[PDB]
Design a protein around this ligand. Structure first.
Ligand SMILES: CNC(=O)CN(c1cccc(Cl)c1)S(C)(=O)=O
Ligand SMILES: CNC(=O)CN(c1cccc(Cl)c1)S(C)(=O)=O
Ligand SMILES: CNC(=O)CN(c1cccc(Cl)c1)S(C)(=O)=O
Ligand SMILES: CNC(=O)CN(c1cccc(Cl)c1)S(C)(=O)=O
Lengths: 237, 300
């Protein structure tokens, strides 16, 4: 069944599961042609496949060459996503394979179910949650590896850095979703908040700054304020 | 012309014989149906007046034996039987005919409805869907489930229609996932037609039988099968022209015959709107699209 507020804690139990977000697989810039028509130019994209218990992000970079000579690219992108997720599952040892894959967009259900027919015991589930994983390309280091890729590539990231040494998975996912929601609502403000204190550096192998517990509380408050601020700017409240 | 004689009519019942229905009163001088056209399968069906939940019937072909209906007061239904003694049976039928104790199959000469609904239906194939090998006729009722329904509970009493499942390894070649899911031609032409059914006549025969079972008994499993077999064709980009033209004729006569008051339950909105307006064959079913739009424009 669908994952929602009511069964949210299931994300942090000991059954291996992956979220799959396809928002950033097929990405384009729209531009005018010399004749005054409109055309698109693809740019590199990525599949965002995340284990919410452990922070493991299997970031499959989608290089623009995969679209060459293909038609109906927005449809193909869902199938290519499902093809790559299926390939990842097959590449993992049996004891690492997920028991459930949760897709962030319902249009991924049939493509993924069809690609996973060999795995009848892996549940393919939608969600009622509005998750902000499209903003993954606002994390500078992730955007950089995607944009520099010259061929298809899988890049591995822990999206929680070392937070799980100090906090639980539930708290780590909440922090991640707050940060991504903030970056989605006002990317400039959010990045200003995260980088207002340059003394707090991002480790070479990390994605986010090395905040202390107390600093994370302040940061999280500043992100909540940003989200409420933008909500008032949008709705004139 | 052939005859299905009856013991009597001890309980009040609506009797169907193909697309006709008539009422018989409790203990009325009713001994059967004569003038049944040779060359087609037929169905004789029943709805008891005192229990509308009792809807059952028998598919038969009079070329395969002499059949009679006898009420069984223990099992509470009209049963079809076979009389092996031809002489005795011909004499029994002659006596009833002389006494004008039989109704006459009311086929209009201009009318090809029954042929058109049963063109590809063969008793031998019916007997593989409905397995009861000791009889030459086949019992079907409202409640009998299909093999596919049972997979998702008595096997000997099931409708063994060919299982069609669009999200199954049978339907989807490894490495052609998107291709095979969006264009079902492989599954229609190689898996089903070449592999299982052998030819389109057998495919259409099962499609026609499923429709008739759904329409005569309110058999949900048959309704599911009829629509699945339509959708498999309509969702294939590559279908022989003769099959498309025949499918249009098949469906036209099915839609024409359907009781108007049962359209809401017998026609799946999704399948029909998909098939007539979105599918690869949306422009290949002219006669069917015309009758649907003029008879059931609401559903669309
Ligand atoms: C360990 N190698 C890494 O690159 C980083 N990590 C990881 C991330 C994603 C998937 C996998 Cl399988 C491992 S980890 C284990 O350090 O958190
Ligand atoms: C009371 N049981 C019956 O009459 C059954 N019989 C029969 C056979 C063929 C047709 C009819 Cl209609 C009746 S018989 C032979 O016993 O007379
Ligand atoms: C006029 N009422 C009727 O039932 C007439 N009809 C009919 C009657 C008795 C037996 C049979 Cl087989 C049919 S019919 C042909 O219109 O369906
Ligand atoms: C789920 N419905 C059932 O099992 C029985 N019904 C039905 C519904 C749609 C098509 C068909 Cl053939 C039958 S009925 C007769 O009650 O309307």
């Amino acid at each position: 069944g669908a994952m929602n507020s009511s069964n949210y804690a299931e994300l942090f139990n000991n059954d291996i599961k992956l979220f799959v977000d396809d928002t950033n697989v097929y990405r384009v810039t729209v531009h005018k042609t010399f004749e005054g028509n409109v055309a698109t130019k693809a740019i590199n994209g990525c599949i965002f496949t995340l284990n919410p218990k452990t922070g493991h992000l299997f970031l499959k970079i989608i290089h623009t060459s995969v679209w060459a000579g293909q038609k109906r690219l927005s449809q193909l992108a869902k199938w290519k996503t499902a093809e790559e997720v299926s390939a990842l599952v097959r590449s993992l040892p049996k004891e690492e394979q997920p028991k459930q894959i949760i897709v962030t967009r319902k249009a991924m259900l049939d493509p993924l179910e069809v690609h996973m027919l060999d795995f009848p015991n892996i549940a393919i589930r939608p969600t009622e949650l509005r998750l902000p994983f499209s903003a993954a390309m606002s994390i500078d280091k992730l955007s950089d590896v995607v944009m520099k890729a010259t061929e298809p590539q899988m890049v591995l990231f822990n999206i929680y850095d070392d937070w799980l040494d100090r906090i639980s998975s539930y708290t780590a996912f909440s922090r991640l979703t707050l940060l991504l929601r903030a970056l989605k609502t006002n990317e400039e403000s959010a990045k200003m908040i995260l980088l207002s204190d340059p003394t707090i550096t991002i480790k070479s192998y990390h994605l986010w700054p090395s905040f202390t517990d107390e600093q994370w509380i302040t940061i999280e408050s500043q992100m909540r304020d940003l989200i409420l601020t933008e909500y008032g700017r949008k709705y004139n409240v | 012309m052939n005859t299905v004689p009856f013991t009597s009519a001890p309980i009040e019942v609506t009797i169907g014989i193909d697309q006709y229905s008539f009422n018989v009163k409790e203990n009325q001088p009713f001994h059967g149906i004569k003038d049944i056209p040779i060359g087609h399968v037929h169905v004789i069906h029943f709805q008891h007046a005192d229990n509308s939940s009792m809807r059952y019937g028998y598919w038969f072909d009079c070329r395969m034996g002499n059949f009679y209906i006898q009420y069984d007061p223990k099992d509470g239904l009209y049963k079809m039987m076979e009389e092996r003694d031809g002489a005795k049976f011909e004499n029994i039928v002659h006596n009833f005919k002389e006494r004008q104790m039989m109704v006459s199959y009311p086929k209009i000469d201009e009318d090809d409805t029954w042929y058109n609904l049963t063109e590809f239906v063969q008793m031998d194939k019916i007997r593989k869907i409905v397995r009861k090998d000791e009889n030459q006729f086949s019992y079907v009722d409202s409640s009998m489930t299909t093999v596919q329904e049972n997979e998702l509970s008595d096997p000997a009493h099931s409708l063994n229609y060919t299982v069609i499942n669009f999200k199954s390894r049978e339907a989807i070649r490894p490495g052609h996932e998107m291709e095979d899911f969006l264009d079902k031609s492989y599954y229609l032409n190689t898996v089903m037609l070449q592999g299982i059914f052998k030819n389109s006549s057998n495919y259409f025969g099962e499609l026609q039988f499923a429709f008739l079972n759904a329409m005569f008994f309110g058999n949900y499993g048959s309704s599911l099968q009829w629509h699945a077999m339509i959708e498999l064709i309509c969702s294939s980009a590559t279908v022989p022209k003769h099959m498309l033209d025949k499918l249009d004729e098949i469906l036209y006569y099915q839609i024409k015959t359907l009781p108007e008051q049962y359209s809401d339950i017998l026609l799946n909105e999704r399948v029909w709107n998909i098939c007539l307006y979105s599918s690869f064959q949306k422009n290949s079913l002219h006669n069917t699209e015309k009758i649907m739009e003029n008879k059931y424009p609401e559903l669309l």
